[PDB]
């Protein structure tokens, strides 16, 4: 079934969709289409855990009920620099402001 993913690296974030039976390799191919970074110099992380391009997204633990459009699975992305991979870095989305008192829970 479907999977909806957010691929994230530093400030960047790509929304995308894939079949559960698809593999991380064509996800990298999508990353190629957007950022033109050859597959070998990009690595992808599920949680603080890396993967293998060949494995099918299903065995990566992505699943339709896991990866709804309204709550995609986050995937970390990193590139080589000087032929060496950067450390995974991802800026948090700025935290929401204080909830107004009139809206505060009863």
């Amino acid at each position: 079934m479907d999977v909806f993913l957010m691929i994230r690296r530093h400030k960047t974030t790509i929304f995308t969709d894939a079949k559960e039976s698809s593999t991380v390799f064509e996800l990298k191919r999508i990353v190629e289409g957007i950022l033109k970074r050859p597959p070998d110099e990009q690595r992808l992380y599920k949680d603080d855990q890396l993967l293998d391009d060949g494995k099918t997204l299903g065995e990566c633990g992505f699943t339709s009920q896991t990866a709804r459009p309204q709550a995609p699975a986050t995937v970390g992305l990193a590139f080589r620099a000087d032929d060496t991979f950067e450390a995974l870095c991802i800026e948090p989305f700025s935290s929401p402001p204080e909830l107004p008192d009139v809206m505060k829970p009863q």
């Binding site: 974030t13 790509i14 929304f15 995609p72 700025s94």
Partner: protein, 85 residues
Amino acid sequence: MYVKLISSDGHEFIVKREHALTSGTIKAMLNEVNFREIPSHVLSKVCMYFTYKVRYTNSSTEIPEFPIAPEIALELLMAANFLDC
């Protein structure tokens, strides 16, 4: 194919153009768009909304609820007003 939206805190969200045209304001305004006034936590949710609105448009099945956290609700309302969604 893809269109790039920039948040006020400088995050850069890439989305499918067919999804981005869900926004009327995007449709009028446009392969890059820069938002001076929307924070990343809101705009990311807005792009989730675009993906949801596409994937459940004219849905035969019952549409699942869109989860909004109360804290971001008040800023999502404005952002959806400005973006005319």
